[PDB]
């Protein structure tokens, strides 16, 4: 069916591939490819271009974002039981907390300052030294990345040490700032479609367009290139430590450690690897491993190929192609005039993952498609009605509901099938406000979040500290007594006004209801 579309269709209407295969084979294959490239027989991993045009940020103060250093996402924490090294897959929050406990620091900024201000590698920062931190930060764990459309054989992603995460965060923030300075298309506030229009404007002058991709992009970016870029932008010793950890990195495959001298392990650094190419020329619009340039004559094509080779961006012969009337970037296809190409394009379907969340996601998808002119409004209305009927068929059973209220959706025992226009204009019962794309979270979303919070890796016996006063900054240091006092005061205040829990606040509804 995707083959018989009048316009452009990428076949995104079904969910991506998934399976339970172990990640050993994929990680081993990636490591073998990296080793082969390091041998210098398959692809080029030596950088030849000049990066003298990148501004030096060595005078910028060292600033660390605390929020991105804590997350529910997985990470690897290394411990020493009896001299040997044991890698445990934990949450980034627990890993960072363990690192801070081991080094006895109040915040990551203090830790990095202490690390950068030691007299020797053997000097002790708490119970460890910089040498031990560097030794531990070179261990990685492997997992499988699934649900990637167009990848029947899933690839391998890697979990790193909290110290590695800290240094990577600093260096990537600075590299992203430099990229934004270099060109306007790399601004922080820019959607994929807007970057596509900017690309169309950039490459409009010339005749042929080269829609290209890189092959083995992560394996062909050596630590030497990263060090070169970081020196070009002036990272000081942080870049040296990162390069040293990358060069000596080890990967835990199943139950054995494997050395991986070459590569950067599946996109740990995107801004740096993009600067590797953007710092040598301006006739490119690279976005990591998906670039687009323009040319007029075969001579310019030869210059483009030489530029790509010299900057370790190995062109992919299996996907790269040349166009005259189309423009592909970030999986988005436009015309040479910047108009969106007719057809489904990147429109993706919504799988069944809840009676209400499915409707919210369908509403968001239909809103996106209609706003961009992909389909007319009446088609959106019909599709929303059909999805509502399908949800009623799937979820209208005693396992999920026992109600019969008229205003309820047909999938929860009610008899209401609202129209898309009615939902979008807020002309409905307040129970439907959650189904609006901009409304509050749905019941099933809250239930799933609460269930996730109780999982083995995230379960904690600590006293939750929520409903904080808006004034108190998140950098203020607290202790057990402080948390107890704040919680008790908030509980007393809530009880004094006839409430047990705080009432959810929604920005859109609040603003609308305001006088």
């Amino acid at each position: 069916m995707w083959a018989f579309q009048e316009g452009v269709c990428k076949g995104n209407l079904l969910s991506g591939p998934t399976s339970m295969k172990a990640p050993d084979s994929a990680a081993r294959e990636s490591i073998d490819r990296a080793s082969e490239i390091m041998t210098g027989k398959s692809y080029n991993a030596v950088h030849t271009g000049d990066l003298s045009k990148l501004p030096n940020q060595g005078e910028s103060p060292l600033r660390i974002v605390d929020s991105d250093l804590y997350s529910e996402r997985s990470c690897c924490w290394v411990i020493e039981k009896e001299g040997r090294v044991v890698c445990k897959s934990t949450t980034l929050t627990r890993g960072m907390t363990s690192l801070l406990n081991t080094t006895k620091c109040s915040s990551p900024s203090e830790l990095i300052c202490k690390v950068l201000t030691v007299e020797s590698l053997s000097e002790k920062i708490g119970d460890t030294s910089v040498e031990e931190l560097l030794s531990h930060g070179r261990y990685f764990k492997c997992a499988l990345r699934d649900q990637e459309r167009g990848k029947p054989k899933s690839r391998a992603i890697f979990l790193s040490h909290p110290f590695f995460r800290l240094l990577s965060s600093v260096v990537e923030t600075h590299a992203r700032s430099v990229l934004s300075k270099v060109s306007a298309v790399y601004t922080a506030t820019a959607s994929a479609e807007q970057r596509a229009m900017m690309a169309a404007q950039v490459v409009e002058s010339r005749k042929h367009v080269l829609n290209g991709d890189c092959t083995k992009y992560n394996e062909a970016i050596d630590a030497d290139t990263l060090l070169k870029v970081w020196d070009a932008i002036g990272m000081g010793s942080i870049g040296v430590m990162l390069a040293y950890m990358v060069r000596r990195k080890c990967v835990l495959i199943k139950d054995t450690l494997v050395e991986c001298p070459g590569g950067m392990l599946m996109g740990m650094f995107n801004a740096t690897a993009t600067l590797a190419l953007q710092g040598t020329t301006d006739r490119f619009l690279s976005f990591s491993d998906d670039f687009i340039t323009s040319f007029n004559s075969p001579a310019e094509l030869r210059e483009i190929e030489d530029l790509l080779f010299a900057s370790c961006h190995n062109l992919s012969l299996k996907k790269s192609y040349i166009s005259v009337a189309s423009l592909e970037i970030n999986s988005c296809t436009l015309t040479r005039d910047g108009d969106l190409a007719t057809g489904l394009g990147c429109t993706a379907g919504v799988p069944f993952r809840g009676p209400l969340v499915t409707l919210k996601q369908t509403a968001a998808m239909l809103s996106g498609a209609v706003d961009s002119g992909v389909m007319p409004f009446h088609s959106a209305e019909r599709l929303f009605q059909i999805k509502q009927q399908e949800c009623a068929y799937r979820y209208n059973n005693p396992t999920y509901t026992t109600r019969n209220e008229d205003f309820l959706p047909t999938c929860l025992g009610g008899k209401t099938v609202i129209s898309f226009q009615s939902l979008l204009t807020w002309d409905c019962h307040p129970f439907w406000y959650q189904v609006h794309p901009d409304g509050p979270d749905t019941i099933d979303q809250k239930v799933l979040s609460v269930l996730a919070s109780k999982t083995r890796r995230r379960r904690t016996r600590l006293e939750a500290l929520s409903d904080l006063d808006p004034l108190v900054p998140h950098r203020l240091l607290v202790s057990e007594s402080d948390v107890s006092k704040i919680r008790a005061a908030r509980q007393a205040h809530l009880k004094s006004l006839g409430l047990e829990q705080p009432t959810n606040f929604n920005y859109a509804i609040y603003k609308a209801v305001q006088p």
Binding site: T189, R353, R403, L468, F505
Partner: protein
């Protein structure tokens, strides 16, 4: 002894961000196991029962959108919509009323949203989410 001592061993003072990161329960990820989790122990059924009788009769009834203007198809462009944040006094009042502190605190930040649109009007006005085709204008 205390769980604080066990978690943050060796430290008697930790930042609020780190403390909260150990008790975050408002993050949702769409995964394949959604239906199984919802079916387990009739958790969604119980949550719906609780919502229909404890939380539902507190949502304010906001008014519907009325203003709309004629629009015609045009070149794809990016619409920038600026939503301001709560002021300090407004945040304090909302907190003292009894609203969730986290939501009010997060609403303080000013926000800007970029949306692609393929429709326009004579006066070049900004439209609502998913209604640019019909022409419902933000009027702000």
């Amino acid at each position: 002894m205390s769980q604080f001592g066990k978690s943050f061993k060796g430290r008697t003072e930790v930042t609020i961000t780190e403390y909260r990161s150990h008790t975050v329960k408002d993050v949702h990820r769409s995964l394949l196991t959604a239906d199984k989790s919802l079916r387990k122990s009739f958790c969604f059924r119980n949550a719906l029962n609780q919502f229909l009788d404890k939380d539902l009769p507190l949502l304010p009834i906001r008014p519907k959108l009325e203003s709309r203007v004629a629009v015609k198809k045009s070149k794809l462009r990016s619409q920038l919509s600026f939503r301001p944040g709560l002021t300090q006094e407004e945040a304090i009042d909302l907190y003292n009323k009894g609203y969730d502190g986290d939501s009010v605190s997060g609403a303080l930040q000013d926000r800007v949203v970029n949306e692609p649109v393929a429709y326009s009007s004579a006066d070049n006005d900004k439209f609502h989410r998913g209604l640019a085709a019909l022409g419902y204008t933000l009027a702000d």
